[PDB]
C-alpha cells in the first residue's frame, strides 16, 4: 500500500520557489546532499561508540555517487543512520518548517539560494536539477521505505520491496532534460573537488558501461 501525504504549506512554498526561481549556480545541490550524507554517517558513528551492535547492519561508512545516463538519474548512496518512517514524514529528519521561515527571511536580508544548507533544508536544493526525487532508506529500528515526490504539493511513502540496503539512504535524482551535465564524470569530479574536498568519508564515483 502507498500512503499519500500533503506537504506542510511552508515546504510547498519553499519547493515552488526553488523550482521557479532563475538561479544559474545549480551545482550546489550536490554539495548539500553530500553534506547531509556526511551528517548521517557521523550520527551512526557516534551511536556506535557506546553500542557497537549498531554497526551489525554494515560496518563500512562511505558515500557512493552513481550516474546512469540511460535512466537519466544520479544516485547518492550513504551507509549512514537512515530514516524511520516518522523521520520521512517529518520532512526527512529536518526542522523544515522553522528552517524554511528563517531561510526566506534571509533571502530578503541579502542572502542567496546557495546558503540554503545553513537553514537545515539543503535537501530541497535537489529540485534545482530534478523533476522527481526518490529516497530509499533503512534505519536499524524500522523497515525499508521509499519516499517520492515530483513536487506539486504531495509526497508518497511505501514499504520498499527492492534490493535490501542493510542501513542507510539512497537519494535518486530524476534529472530534468536540460540538466544532464550532472551525469558527466568530469563535471561531477569538478563539483566534488570544489565543494566537498574535506568530507571525512570516502566518496566513490561509479563509472558507466557504454
Ligand X SMILES: Nc1ncnc2[nH]cnc12
Q: Does the annotation place 20 within a ligand binding site?
A: no
* 127 near ligand X (CB under 6 A): no
Q: Which residue has the cell 535524482?
A: 173
Nearest to 122 by CA among 195, 193, 68: 195
- Of residues 182-201, which lie at the interface with ligand X (CB under 6 A)? none
- Integer CA distances (angstroms), 138 to 6, 111, 145, in order: 22, 35, 7
* 80 near ligand X (CB under 6 A): yes
Among 7, 103, 119, 123, binds ligand X (CB under 6 A): 123
Among 5-13, 80-88, 95-103, 158-166, the segment contacting ligand X (CB under 6 A): 80-88
**8 A C-beta contact, residue 183 and residue 175:** yes
Closest distance to ligand X from the beta carbon of 94 (Å): 6
- Of residues 93-122, which lie at the interface with ligand X (CB under 6 A)? 93
Among 83, 126, 129, 172, binds ligand X (CB under 6 A): 83
> From its phi and psi, is residue 126 left (phi > 0), alpha (psi between -120 and 50) or beta?
alpha
**8 A C-beta contact, residue 175 and residue 10:** no
Which residues bind to ligand X, rule: CB under 6 A? 36-37, 40, 78, 80-81, 83, 92-93, 123, 169
Amino acid at each position: 500500500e502507498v500512503e499519500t501525504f500533503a506537504f506542510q504549506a511552508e515546504i510547498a512554498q519553499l519547493m515552488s520557489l526553488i523550482i521557479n526561481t532563475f538561479y544559474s549556480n545549480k551545482e550546489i545541490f550536490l554539495r548539500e546532499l553530500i553534506s547531509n550524507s556526511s551528517d548521517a554517517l557521523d550520527k551512526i558513528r557516534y551511536e556506535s561508540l557506546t553500542d557497537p551492535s549498531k554497526l551489525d547492519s554494515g560496518k563500512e561508512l562511505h558515500i557512493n555517487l552513481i550516474p546512469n545516463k540511460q535512466d537519466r538519474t544520479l544516485t547518492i548512496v550513504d551507509t549512514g543512520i537512515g530514516m524511520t518512517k516518522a523521520d520521512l514524514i517529518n520532512n526527512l529528519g529536518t526542522i523544515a518548517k522553522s528552517g524554511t521561515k528563517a531561510f526566506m527571511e534571509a533571502l530578503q536580508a541579502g542572502a542567496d539560494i546557495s546558503m540554503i544548507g545553513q537553514f537545515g533544508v539543503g535537501f530541497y536544493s535537489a529540485y534545482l536539477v530534478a523533476e522527481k526525487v526518490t529516497v530509499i532508506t533503512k534505519h536499524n529500528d524500522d523497515e525499508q521505505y521509499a519516499w517520492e515526490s515530483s513536487a506539486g504539493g504531495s509526497f508518497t511513502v511505501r514499504t520498499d520491496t527492492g534490493e535490501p540496503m542493510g542501513r542507510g539512504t539512497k537519494v535518486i535524482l530524476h534529472l530534468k532534460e536540460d540538466q544532464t551535465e550532472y551525469l558527466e564524470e568530469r563535471r561531477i569530479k569538478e563539483i566534488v573537488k570544489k565543494h566537498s574536498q574535506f568530507i571525512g568519508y570516502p566518496i566513490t564515483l561509479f563509472v558507466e558501461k557504454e
